[PDB]
Symmetry: C5
Subunit: 346 residues, 5 copies
């Protein structure tokens, strides 16, 4: 009746329970059903290609040696300090770079035991998980982060992991990300590792994150468009003001180069072309073409009177031709980069 003697009667030397033996030795494999609650989600860094998460991991399995029939209550929520005295699955995260438990006050490790021997085991973890990021279409990209739960020491004939049938991944209410939107749907997949040591169980969960475009509109696109429009001002300046137009061209080209360099400041040094790179390259080509247009005008207007009329015609043609070509480029760029974004994330 007392609780103290029941605790060590269930598991102990008198009971003969061995925590080094899985519940069904030399029998069917242990079936562990897992679910995850995401308390926080952030620190998504493209430079290191990883993200930090904080979760409650819940594992449920069955231990026949832990079945009791004395206490009337079906479930026993006991003290989370006898985890060392019972068998537990050897779960680990395959793509984890860094993981830690939480020891604030009492370690966060809930354990409930049912009448039939069902064990529920909940533990709070902080993980840093690697995420290979495809940075093509970078300002308008969608990334897929994965989380793999794998057995390290037991093969498929001893330990099998399964996702819970209902709500395997829950997210804390009000969880928002400053840079990304987390899609409501989450993919559950069956990884299965094959090493030279054998076959090991694995379960995978995939989160989809869409980058928000407002910051890049404020920071990169609008300043570059302003530089292009500023370079167009040269066409309305008197053709005899050589220092003015030449300085306009120089400053616009150099500023465009600086902005192109700065657009990849917080990104890994990937060796393919991104969407922002295409935008910056076209803007640089536009400002360079404006400077070359003035160079042609200056060269033509001193060939001595059709040489003056020809330069005036070049300026008047450019005044309308540059914005029209830029508008056509903008239409094509935005249409094709909002059409690629209609490709299925899967």
């Amino acid at each position: 009746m007392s609780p103290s003697d029941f605790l060590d009667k269930l598991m102990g030397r008198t009971s003969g329970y061995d925590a080094r033996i899985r519940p069904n030795f030399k029998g069917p494999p242990v079936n562990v059903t897992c679910n995850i609650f995401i308390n926080s989600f952030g620190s998504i860094a493209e430079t290191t290609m990883d993200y930090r998460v904080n979760i409650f991991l819940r594992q449920k399995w069955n231990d026949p040696r832990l079945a009791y029939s004395e206490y009337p209550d079906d479930s026993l929520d006991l003290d989370p300090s006898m985890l060392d005295s019972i068998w537990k699955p050897d779960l680990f995260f395959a793509n984890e770079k860094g993981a830690n438990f939480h020891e604030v006050t009492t370690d966060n490790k809930l354990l409930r035991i049912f009448k039939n021997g069902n064990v529920l085991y909940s533990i709070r973890l902080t993980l840093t998980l690697s995420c290979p990021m495809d940075l093509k279409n970078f300002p308008m990209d969608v990334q897929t982060c994965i989380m793999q739960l794998e057995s390290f020491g037991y093969t498929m004939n001893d330990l099998i992991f399964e996702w819970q049938d209902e709500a395997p991944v829950q997210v804390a209410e009000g969880l928002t990300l400053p840079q990304f939107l987390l899609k409501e749907e989450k993919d559950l997949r069956y990884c299965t590792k094959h090493y030279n040591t054998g076959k090991f169980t694995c379960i995978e969960v995939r989160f989809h994150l869409e980058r928000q475009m407002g910051y890049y509109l404020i920071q990169m696109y609008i300043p570059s468009l302003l530089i292009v429009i500023l370079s167009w001002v040269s066409f309305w300046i008197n053709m005899d003001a050589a220092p003015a137009r030449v300085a306009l061209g120089i400053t616009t080209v150099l500023t465009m180069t600086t902005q192109s360099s700065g657009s990849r400041a917080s990104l890994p040094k990937v060796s393919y072309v991104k969407a922002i790179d295409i935008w910056m390259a076209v803007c640089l080509l536009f400002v360079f073409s404006a400077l070359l247009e003035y160079a042609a005008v200056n060269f033509v207007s001193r060939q001595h009177k059709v040489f003056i009329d020809r330069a005036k015609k070049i300026d008047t043609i450019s005044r309308a031709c540059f914005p029209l070509a830029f508008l056509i480029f903008n239409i094509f760029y935005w249409v094709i980069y909002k059409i690629l974004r209609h490709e299925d994330i899967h």
Copy 2:
């Protein structure tokens, strides 16, 4: 009479005390009253959306098995090394990203036991707590940091947390923050977590922090206003000095772009518009309009004499119209951003 035998007579194998059993087993839930002393408060980072605090956490509860009637003194302040031999609540901080205890010399873990079994337990902690920050109205914003104290392994029928009736949150005297002002009032709320594992107790405390505006006046607003005034100098320069006025416009526009980029250097990449963004955008529009005004003057004054008088009229009109419009914008901006700040923090 001796202290040594009393210490292990109160809790030990002879006494039969079990630290794995809560004080009132199969009875009413344990009522733990908590209070907090804030020793330090700082490291408020908008990029990571967290703040670091150092606290003394005091928990008081009642243990009937710990009631004694031998020693005359009502309270016993004993050695803080037998915390492992008594039951303690499993408190944890829900929004904590990182927590640590202090082990300098002797671990800081005071324990007092009263005659009636009242236990007072004080522990020094350093916490990093996540704070979701609303950066709209950024230079003139007010943030609300929260701290949640929650039970991990016990449900509401076993463990209930309550704030102390008098002085639940105390702050160290002379505690100041370089960037923020901490409001005297603190909000105490009742969170209550509902997971698939059950219902768990929670208590919340909210601190209000008002950002001080002096640094942003020195660093961002005044330099931008100086750039705008500098761009106004062009209107008083001779209209024939094309390189001078064109260079003025170019340099002011490029400097304005650089300042706008630098105004978000230490901020998260949020995708909404802040107050400083509106200010920078309007200043950029003003300097761009000054350059376009000179472009119009230069184009008009060479159409050949009303063409010269018209350009002179444009310059004389701009000389008065630009500062007046800027003053009207300043009045509206500051009035509406000191009117929004009158909205109740709650």
Copy 3:
């Protein structure tokens, strides 16, 4: 006679010594005298408002139960591994953000026991201590760092800390700081904490640090003075060279703005005005006034001959008036900021 049996005869089950009981139970409080040797001193960061120190902490007290009369030698320097078997004071550092012990080879924890029971206990620590910094007069400021030694679990009726009468704070010979000068005198004060848990002993030591001005002369003051002198060159250029003088004014103003922004790069975002801020503001006002002077000259000289003579008079007056006013400002600035520095540090 053997040492091995004497070691556990002094403290052990046979002796009846209890390490959980203070030396004079139910009697006068234990008087612990402390002294500190500073091995290193550095990492003074204004952004985080803390400094890192490395110390040897020596505590001396009396334990009557540890008095022996067998060995002829008065002092016994024993192995530093039986610290767990004797009572020790629960000292801690109130303003410490981070502390660590040193475990290189054998842990650094000397223990000597005298014939009369006097215990000397020396331990090597590394501390990060918070220092609230008053950054007014920043380039020519004097800071006061404090170190508080406080009892966590014992009140004044059980434990009292005192500084040693002679040499309570010693500094390692040749200890220098790259940015600061450490004053020879150190202040010893009596803090005493009053919480809702009671009254706790505290002792405080204050170090005074004077910032050295050579780096700021090389880095900030001289470049700004050079920019001001460069802006004065405009007064000697021909008044018809509008692009030259206008470009001089623009570049000087923009460079002054950049230097003013950079002068607060490694400082916390405080919301008051510092001395370097006043210097930068006055230099910016000077260069802006030079540009406005040229704007006035350019406007006046085209009003058509007294209009040319008047502009020449303005230039000739400015040539002498600008350096004289700057010299007067320099005299006042340096005099009042070397007069404020004569205020007593206490």
Copy 4:
């Protein structure tokens, strides 16, 4: 038959097994065969000259005292908590700056014991390994990272390490690096340490990494080439526009200096010349020569008419001579830096 008594019958006080004695005491040395699975590979930093890896390390050896003949199954995959009760080799990584084990849930330490006493021991590690990098030919370099497995406490007469005959190094499928390509072939070598303490076994594995050139084309080469082409525009401007051409030369030279400084931002301060340094130096020489060409033209054209024709001839010659010389330099540079890259990596 029971597992519990078999576990401590194999190794324990009853068996007489001593974990402090190697399997063949006073006999032939223990032959440990090792293999490695690389789970992740990244964080290759030139500044610190190290790279971070995550591996599964598998060691196989023979322990005659662990041979059993009771259980029918040839292999026993037991609980990974009795590693302390058996002898294990003292492997360590010679070039490791930082190493850590993984304790997520159950520590990742698989152990299998065969009928004949063969022990297979697999452990998950995260290593930071130093890599001395030869940065000559930096944008087009190939680096060789090494990993050394060495015995610390046993000499060659007690412990010998060998690579597994088949698949000693496996890489996870889909493992990619943002900056480098990892060559399929891996070199296996026999290091052998000779200290004053004796001779110690060592085995080495070498990975070859080729840097991808796309990022440096986008970031460094193309902007510099654009600056050079921009400097060529001066030759087509009217020779009387002195401020325009002089400003072109100044801006191109200063931008070239800034790009040369920025090309070594994320590199160690090595004291030899790299390929990117040669490219930047030649580009700087080209833009400086363009400015000096205009200086010569300006000086010649005012010697007063053959002085005007001579300056025109200089400009017309430069118009064709500068791009031709730059093209010849580009041909030579790229040919010799894609010829050096044909040198055998070994």
Copy 5:
């Protein structure tokens, strides 16, 4: 004969060996001879004034109680897990800011015991050691790093440290440093600490590091020399081109200021003058003098014809006088900073 009983017969309760007593109690002090193997050497940071090293530390002493006469072999290389059961010296590093042991696989702690009781104890450590750096002559300086090995708990009458007579400091073959050259000779000195707690043994080793000058030639000296040569181009431009020459002077002065600021980017904020500071100051003075020369020419040439001839004479004199004075300064600077470097390092 068996090894297992011999291991605990040598040290154990049966033997009576006490690890808390030094080998010769109440006798002559223990003489520990030390030597060091440097596996790696790097991370020399001037900002924090420290360097990181990785070493094997070998200590040899004599323990009479450990002398055996049973096993025929003179030396026993036993398992490195019984270090807790024998006495060891309490060595520590006086100038260490951070130290860590290596626990990869089996902890790296070799122990050999000889027939006569000689103990050899080797341990792998990673240290961060503070190094006070004299940054006068910074680009061409030589630094001296020290390493102190000191006893913490034992005085000179109990424990004495000595360097090994032959090869006390060995360096791994092929050890190179990107920024420094490590001199072959190493100084061995006798520190001896005198505290208020007594006299403590210490041994010191000094390494000499010479900074390599190639990086600073590429990064700082050559760009500044190019800026000076660029400023000399103004003397060959027509004296009537005021915007061109004035812009040349402005850009050269501002770029020189920026380079002077950037030359101390990765250095502590010391308050004395370095060699690079002298170089930058003289270059800044040269470019400022060129601008002032043009200002004088512009002022003189409009005093209205001897006023034109005088300005032409000033320009022609400057054309030869500026490079000659710069060459003389270069000769003096390099001669005296390669003469100071001939001072003996000791």
